[PDB]
Write a protein that binds this ligand. Structure first.
Ligand SMILES: N=C(N)c1ccc2[nH]c(-c3cccc(-c4ccccc4)c3O)nc2c1
Lengths: 246, 9
């Protein structure tokens, strides 16, 4: 996240940290995700596309730091990894970039609720906030586009939803953005999501609830003028989500 | 106690 403040997971109790194991001893961060129900985390297909070996990923709930432990955290294995059929990427955008991970603990259980572990709410069929709404994004991704390391502390920031009309302006992303994506930026192009934030959540309040309105997906640069962050429009995938989380 | 989506405590 470029800008933003540092937070603790108590302020984002639905955020999940997904890591990959390597033979040699290291586990590296892959992407963020969010918990929808006790056994399901939702993230982005492009985070698993180049290495769809579920047994090699570890999911952690209740984590405020990247490589150190947080008391209360829970570790899970990926029981089912569901990527999106029709996922495609072009020179920038990812289409249908949503993925689901069913988690199982070594004792055979799913997540349990605490002050550091909570689910986030889904929107209702194709229902979104109106452009202008302030939503917050969170994650462990880059702090500057030039960095080559990720922060050790969780970060958060607030961005506003913009319209498709504004995003599809030729000098923004033109037709690369579709009806199944959402764009969010800071009025003064100062804070944004960046590499390392993929799969994490875009939360806004809808009809009273804190709802997962978007998934960090792509963007040209980080916090660049007229280059909003693009998110997967969760409200348009509810059928798909249901199809697997039944 | 149990999950209540969207609630921070
Ligand atoms: N400016 C943004 N709003 C933005 C947001 C998320 C991003 N994620 C990435 C990204 C860049 C290189 C590799 C990956 C990646 C991560 C995990 C697995 C595969 C690719 C990214 O998500 N760039 C990103 C840019």
């Amino acid at each position: 996240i470029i800008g933003g403040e540092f937070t603790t997971i108590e302020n984002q109790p639905w955020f999940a940290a997904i890591y990959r194991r390597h033979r040699g001893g290291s586990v590296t961060y892959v992407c963020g995700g969010s918990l929808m129900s006790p056994c399901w985390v939702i993230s982005a297909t492009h985070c698993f596309i180049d290495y769809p070996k579920k047994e090699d990923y570890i999911v952690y709930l209740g984590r405020s730091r990247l490589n150190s432990n947080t008391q209360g955290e829970m570790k899970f294995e990926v029981e089912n990894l569901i990527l999106h059929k029709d996922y495609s990427a072009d020179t920038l955008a990812h289409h249908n970039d949503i993925a689901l991970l069913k988690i199982r603990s070594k004792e055979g259980r799913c997540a349990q609720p605490s002050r550091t572990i909570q689910t986030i709410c889904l929107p209702s069929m194709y229902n979104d906030p109106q452009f202008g709404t302030s939503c917050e994004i969170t994650g462990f991704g880059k702090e500057a586009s030039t960095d080559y390391l990720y922060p050790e502390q969780l970060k958060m920031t607030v961005v506003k939803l913009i319209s498709h009309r504004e995003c599809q302006q030729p000098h923004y992303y033109g037709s690369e953005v579709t009806t199944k994506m959402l764009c969010a930026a800071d009025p003064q192009w100062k804070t944004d999501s960046c590499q390392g934030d993929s799969g994490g959540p875009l939360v806004c309040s809808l009809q009273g609830r804190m709802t997962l309105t978007g998934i960090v997906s792509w963007g040209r640069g980080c916090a660049l003028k007229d280059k909003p962050g693009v998110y997967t429009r969760v409200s348009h995938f509810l059928p798909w989500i249901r199809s697997h989380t039944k | 106690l149990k999950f209540q989506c969207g609630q921070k405590t």
